[PDB]
């Protein structure tokens, strides 16, 4: 609340779990991990602007 009027705010929680933690283990997964961190920070930014 600012100046007596309320507005909503969104916050990101990082649950400690994964499903694709080892997809493509026998061919390569490091570029996939770069995608993971890139899209995680993207999700942070998107939630903030939302």
């Amino acid at each position: 609340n600012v100046a007596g009027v309320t507005l909503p705010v969104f916050e990101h929680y990082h649950e400690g779990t994964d499903s694709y933690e080892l997809t493509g283990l026998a061919r390569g997964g490091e570029q996939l991990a770069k995608l993971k961190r890139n899209y995680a920070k993207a999700v942070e930014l998107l939630v903030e602007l939302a």
Binding site: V2, A3, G4
Partner: protein, 250 residues
């Protein structure tokens, strides 16, 4: 001191007599005895009532709000008996007390008294309820020719500067308090906290006088400077730095 006294039960006619005696004695002291006389008069509302008494006795039809239509001339002759004169060492200063009827600025008596005299000073009921003595409201107060009554040589040079600063800061403090009372401290900046502190300290200390506190101009100037020192020079804009060096870096 020259004390004239006139109780309520005394004759109505003698009520219009005492101010003339006081004025005559004041003129005699100021001019023939080359004195500086501060005359003060009290409750001119009842004086107007006595004027109404004599008007009723005169069988002259009353005027607006029942008061006689020639109140102007009598009050003018009472007010104008002062000033300084050539080839003389003395002056007369008049300070009447008017009992504002029921907060009526449009009442004829205060209107005409404001017309004749120069400037005015207000008191406040709310401040009296706040138990702050004397209850003097400086926001509407105004002295007509203060600019020449004060300055270097007569007193310290920057008195008028200080009073202007205090007035402006008080106005800003009142405004931010009004915004505050509905908005909230969540949206308040530090400079506004400093303004609030200055306001609170100002009514706590400067306005507060007490009954028997003989205060002089120099120490009041020091107190005002101490209040102003709560702020840095950045926002003390209205005063040139050449004169701010006089007391700000103390």
């Amino acid at each position: 001191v020259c004390l004239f006294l006139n109780l309520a039960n005394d004759p109505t006619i003698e009520r219009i007599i005492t101010p003339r005696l006081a004025l005559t004695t004041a003129e005699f002291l100021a001019y023939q005895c080359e004195k500086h006389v501060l005359v003060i008069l009290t409750d001119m509302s009842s004086y107007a009532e006595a004027l109404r008494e004599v008007s009723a006795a005169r069988e002259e039809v009353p005027g607006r709000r029942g008061f006689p239509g020639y109140m102007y001339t009598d009050l003018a002759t009472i007010y104008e008996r002062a000033g300084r004169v050539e080839g003389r060492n003395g002056s007369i200063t008049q300070i009447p007390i008017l009992t504002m009827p029921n907060d009526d600025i449009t009442h004829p008596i205060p209107d005409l008294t404001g017309y004749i005299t120069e400037g005015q000073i207000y008191v406040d009921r709310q401040l009296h309820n706040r138990q702050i003595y004397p209850p003097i409201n400086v926001l509407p107060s105004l002295s007509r020719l203060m600019k020449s009554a004060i300055g270097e040589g007569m007193t310290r040079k920057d008195h008028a500067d200080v009073s202007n600063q205090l007035y402006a800061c008080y106005a800003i403090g009142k405004d931010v308090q009004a915004m505050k009372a509905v908005v909230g401290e969540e949206a308040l900046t530090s400079d506004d906290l400093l303004y609030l502190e200055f306001l609170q300290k100002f009514e706590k200390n400067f306005i507060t006088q007490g009954p028997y506190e003989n205060r002089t101009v120099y120490e009041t100037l020091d107190i005002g400077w101490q209040l102003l020192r709560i702020f840095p020079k950045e926002m003390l804009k209205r005063i040139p730095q050449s004169t701010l060096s006089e007391f700000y870096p103390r």
